A paper describes a structure:
TOPBP1 and its fission and budding yeast orthologues Rad4 and Dpb11, respectively, are scaffold proteins that mediate formation of multi-protein complexes in a range of essential DNA replication and repair processes. Bioinformatic analysis suggests that only three of the BRCT domains in the yeast TOPBP1 homologues, and four in the vertebrate TOPBP1 homologues, possess the required cluster of residues needed to bind phosphorylated peptide motifs. Despite the structural similarity of these phosphopeptide-binding BRCT domains, genetic and biochemical studies show that they are nonetheless selective and specific for the phosphopeptide sequences with which they interact. To gain some insight into this, we have determined crystal structures of segments of yeast and vertebrate TOPBP1 that contain the two most N-terminal phosphopeptide binding sites (BRCT1 and BRCT2), in complex with phosphopeptides derived from a number of different known ligand proteins, including RAD9, and used this to develop consensus patterns that encapsulate the individual specificity requirements of these two independent binding sites.
We have now also determined the crystal structure of a bis-phosphorylated pT636-pT650 peptide from Sld3 (the fission yeast homologue of Treslin), which interacts simultaneously with Rad4-BRCT1 and Rad4-BRCT2, albeit with different molecules in the asymmetric unit of the crystals. In these complexes, the peptide backbone upstream of the phosphorylated residue maintains a consistent β-sheet conformation, and does not contain the tight turn seen for the hydrophobic triplets in peptides bound to the BRCT1 domain of TOPBP1 or Rad4. In BRCT2, however, the size of the recess is restricted by the side chain of a highly conserved tryptophan residue (Trp158 in Rad4; Trp257 in human TOPBP1) at the C-terminal end of the α-helix, and can only accommodate a single hydrophobic side chain, requiring that the peptide chain continues in an extended β-sheet conformation. Sequences with hydrophobic residues at −3 and −4 (and often −5) as in the RAD9-pS387, Crb2-pT187, Sld3-pT636 and Treslin-pS1001 (993-DIGVVEEpSP) peptides conform to this requirement, whereas sequences with large polar side chains such as Crb2-pT235 where −4 is arginine, or Sld3-pT650 where −4 is glutamate, do not, and are restricted to binding to BRCT2.
Author numbering:
A (entry chain A): 4 to 186
B (entry chain B): 626, 629 to 652
The structure:
């Protein structure tokens, strides 16, 4: 009858057209839809991590599931084809990757730590960057010196300790950089 | 509960045009 009864869905950094598609199909599935991020939101469909909505969910609402943009269209298509939906409602198969849109660079960290960090960045949906460029989102710095570090500061790129990575992975969300500032 | 934690992202203003792109090839 209504597979998404009890769900309350909100979007962040989703283009208006795809937002209307999600809004209409989620409502058809029995969910409620919110344009504002209200207290009763249960699922946040996100197209970026650098938004006030994403940041609030990551900071304060671990109960809220952060979903990729194709979750509702895929779920809707399966239902409208009369396929049988299990209890999970495909939520786990369409969680947004933890490091979605992250481009991670490193400095002042030895081997074998460098190889391990790259492994986990890729495993959680991010891009690993051997060179620092202007579109790097996070520079993991073992200490606050060297050319990568100085130019990250010049270019206004986040500089964090490696605990940013481990705790973002454990939290299943990108955490804000000031929580992981050096010194 | 409809208390607003974070407001919806505002639709961007028209913004005065300052650049016209190279004609695509
Ligand atoms: Ca997405
Ligand atoms: Ca840690």
């Amino acid at each position: 009858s209504k597979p998404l009864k009890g769900f309350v869905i909100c979007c962040t950094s989703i283009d208006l057209k795809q937002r209307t598609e999600i809004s209409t199909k989620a409502t058809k599935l029995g969910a409620a839809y919110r344009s504002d991020f209200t207290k009763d939101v249960t699922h946040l469909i996100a197209g970026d991590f650098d938004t006030p909505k994403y940041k609030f969910a990551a900071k304060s609402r671990p109960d809220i599931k952060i979903m990729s943009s194709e979750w509702i269209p895929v779920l809707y298509e399966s239902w409208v084809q009369g396929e049988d939906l299990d209890d999970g409602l495909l939520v786990d198969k369409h969680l947004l990757p933890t490091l979605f849109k992250c481009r991670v660079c490193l400095t002042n960290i030895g081997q074998p730590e460098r190889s391990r960090i790259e492994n986990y960045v890729l495993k959680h949906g991010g891009t690993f960057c051997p060179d620092l460029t202007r579109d790097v989102t996070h520079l993991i710095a073992g200490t606050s010196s060297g050319r990568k570090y100085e130019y990250a500061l010049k270019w206004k790129i986040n500089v964090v300790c490696v605990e940013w990575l481990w705790q973002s992975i454990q939290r299943n969300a990108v955490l804000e950089p000031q929580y992981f500032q050096l010194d | 509960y409809d208390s607003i934690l974070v407001q919806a992202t505002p639709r961007k203003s028209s913004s005065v045009i300052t650049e016209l792109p190279d004609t695509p090839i």
